[PDB]
From a paper:
Type III PKS catalysis involves the loading of a CoA-tethered substrate onto an active-site cysteine followed by chain elongation via iterative decarboxylative Claisen condensations of malonyl-CoA. Linear poly­ketide intermediates undergo a terminal intramolecular cyclization reaction to produce the final cyclic polyketide product. The five-layered αβαβα topology of secondary-structural elements of each monomer is consistent with the ‘thiolase fold’ originally observed in thiolase and present in all known structures of type III PKSs.
In contrast to BIS, [name] ([name]) generates the core chemical scaffolds of xanthones, guttiferones and sampsoniones that are prominently found in the closely related Hypericaceae and Clusiaceae families. For comparative purposes, we obtained a synthetic gene derived from the gene sequence of [name] [name] ([name]). Similar to previous reports, [name] produced 2,4,6-trihydroxybenzophenone (phlorobenzophenone) when incubated with benzoyl-CoA. Additionally, unlike MdBIS1 and MdBIS3, 4-hydroxycoumarin was not detected when [name] was incubated with salicoyl-CoA as a starter substrate. The crystallographic models of [name] and MdBIS3 contained 772 out of 790 residues and 757 out of 776 residues, respectively. A significant change in the [name] cavity arises from the small-to-large replacement of Leu263 in MdCHS2 with Met267 in [name]. Similarly, the side chain of Met267 of [name] replaces Leu263 of CHS and blocks access to the coumaroyl-binding area of the CHS cavity. Similarly, the side chains of Thr135 and Glu195 and the main-chain atoms of Gly166, Gly342 and Ser343 line the sides of this novel pocket in [name]. Mutagenesis of Thr135 in [name] to Leu resulted in a reduction in chain-elongation steps from three to two and a shift in the terminal cyclization mechanism from Claisen to lactonization. Presumably, a similar water-mediated hydrogen bond stabilizes Tyr269 of [name]; however, the lower resolution of the diffraction data for the [name] crystals prevented the analysis of waters. However, higher resolution structures of [name] are needed for comparisons of subtle changes in backbone, side chain and ordered waters between [name] and BIS.
Residue numbers in the entry:
A (entry chain A), B (entry chain B): 18 to 394
Write the structure that this text describes.
């Protein structure tokens, strides 16, 4: 009678770049090699990032064919959309097929779709495209979530939750996907917000299948259960994150006190979701914190007092992929369940009963989804 | 147990223009009086449109600064967004306050918000802004439906339906709002899809309160009961409507066979929806069809054999407000119940029991929402 995660799939584009070689690549293919001062500010953040590699659609050749994207301030939304209109629902398809395989059921049994992305937008949306790409039924009930940032991962789950629970027999396909072709910019002295993003942002795609009352006889296997899903605006945070969709693509602004505002308010958000269960100790849980850089983790960590033991899964994704936007949190969920089977843990939650999903985005906004593990045999 | 409409509220900008005087206004304030031949076609279209007046935020002086918006092809997305980022949620606020006045409950009772808009987008979205303007709780669960076109009105009804029915005591605030500053273009000889759109689009905004199990003792009153809600892709209609968000704004393209596709495929949707109610006679129902111009309405009615008696509310909205996009279907619902009280009809559905809200848009896509009337006292 409660919603459950029945399958999980992930994927990234084949092309990847090592962080050790990114500063040279980023300044060479923007003809900004002469900005010696910025090359140092950027390099220091790369070292502090503790990110090893990132996947990208954008290659050295594709940027040569799109100088508008390679020039800061220049109009390029025309060229950016030509790429995103196709590659985003396509990368999603790759992920959906992996999760539909584990599910091991007929395509016709899918009745809903929830697509979440900030990378590109048009009409019809990616939710129509992937419906035709996967060959789903023409009567699937779709819900498109455009431009909700990095918390959209928690949003998608909250929407799918009420869908599966209010429609008997319902099976929901959820897809998160991103592509740095939307937010890529060349270095600029006045707008140093870019510097932080270009040493962080990557792309990827995750896919989930939600459904109530798992049919064990049919071959369905629950992975996580969803007990609750809340959303909260953070007090005194107006303006901390703002992103505009201009002719130059997405132009974003970061205030110097994003982490302190999240840090000094996360305690209250946890207290609300977990009192119905009588939980107080924050180390009795498994976590899937949105990897919004080391600061956000190492800072949400200290406040709640989370030991390094429980941040292994979240820090692992950050290191091997970077910030993939809304797909980061589903990536970390797949990380746990799989790591748990290898290490012989009693449950899919690293041997723990309850866990939490933390998504962070503009507002400030915080999405909190309470999860429950299942036994491993 | 079953979601119900509890209140309705609408509004428009004060500034309006008569269809009588729009062709002069259009070719004058875009510096295009030298296109005399093109002006006559427009004139003809404006006369066959059955639209009497439309309300716009865009006045003659506002176009006078942002000449980019008044010049076809020119990059003007920035200027459009500076307008839409503020004016759209401000227009929604004015509508919501009317619905809460009728609802007659404390603002602390609202638990969810659903906003749908194609006109403009940023981060955080217009769901955050309307949450601050109305002074709602920081812990409200909100959904942002961007760029779902003219069927978004029915989608907003379907999401809110599953939220209110899956959450005890939950009360959902629906808001739809559109602004022509996104779709405004100067006349061009080549792109004749633009010319037909300028005689159609308007500004407006509507609001509803959705909740399951009305509390009579708390002063709540029902208006319509939501029995079901569906979505469907039309077979073999790929590319019938496409819209791109380029640097010039929302560039849309309409192929020549849009009406014949909706016309011949709508019957299957109605049969699937009303079959479990034992209904087949389409004139025994009240309607709220999306007025995408005369063409759509006449084509849909001609197939199902709907008489002019049951299309008065639809045409009245198109005649007095023009095509406002996603808000049209909400306007018609309000005219239905308001007209019903004045004429002495026994129900909010023109005396009838069951009715249907039809949302049409790109895909092609068809949103059907079976509705039930309540007794008038």
């Amino acid at each position: 009678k409660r919603a459950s995660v029945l399958a999980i799939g992930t994927t990234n584009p084949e092309h990847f770049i090592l962080q050790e070689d990114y500063p040279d690549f980023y300044f060479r293919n923007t003809n900004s090699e002469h900005m010696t001062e910025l090359k140092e500010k950027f390099k220091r953040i790369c070292v502090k990032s503790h990110i090893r590699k990132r996947h990208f659609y954008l290659t050295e050749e594709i940027l040569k064919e799109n100088q508008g994207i390679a020039t800061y301030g220049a109009g390029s939304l025309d060229a950016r959309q030509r790429i995103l209109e196709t590659e985003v629902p396509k990368l999603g398809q790759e992920a959906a097929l992996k999760a539909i395989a584990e599910w091991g059921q007929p395509i016709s049994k899918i009745t809903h779709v929830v697509f979440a992305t900030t990378s590109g937008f048009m009409m019809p949306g990616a939710d129509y495209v992937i419906t035709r790409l996967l060959g789903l039924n023409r009567t699937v009930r779709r819900v498109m979530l455009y431009n909700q940032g990095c918390f959209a991962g928690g949003t998608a789950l909250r929407v799918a939750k009420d869908l599966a629970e209010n429609n008997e027999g319902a099976r929901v396909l959820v897809v998160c996907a991103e592509n740095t072709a939307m937010t890529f910019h060349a270095p600029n002295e006045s707008h140093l917000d870019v510097i932080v993003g270009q040493a962080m942002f990557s792309d990827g795609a995750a896919a989930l299948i939600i459904g109530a009352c798992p049919d064990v006889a049919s071959g369905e296997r629950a992975v996580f259960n969803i007990l609750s899903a809340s959303q909260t605006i953070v007090p005194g945070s107006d303006g901390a994150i703002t992103a505009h969709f201009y002719e130059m693509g997405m132009s974003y602004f970061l205030k110097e006190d994003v982490i302190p505002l999240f840090r000094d308010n996360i305690a209250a958000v946890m207290e609300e979701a977990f009192s119905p269960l009588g939980v107080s100790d924050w180390n009795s849980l498994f976590y899937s914190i949105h990897p919004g850089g080391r600061g956000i983790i190492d800072g949400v960590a200290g406040n709640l007092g989370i030991k390094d033991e429980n941040l292994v899964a979240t820090r692992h994704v950050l290191g091997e992929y970077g910030n993939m936007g809304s797909a980061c949190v589903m990536f970390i969920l797949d990380e746990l369940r799989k790591s748990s089977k290898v290490n012989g843990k009693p449950t899919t939650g690293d041997g723990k009963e309850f866990g939490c999903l933390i998504g962070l985005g503009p507002g400030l906004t915080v999405e909190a989804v309470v999860l429950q593990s299942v036994p491993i045999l």
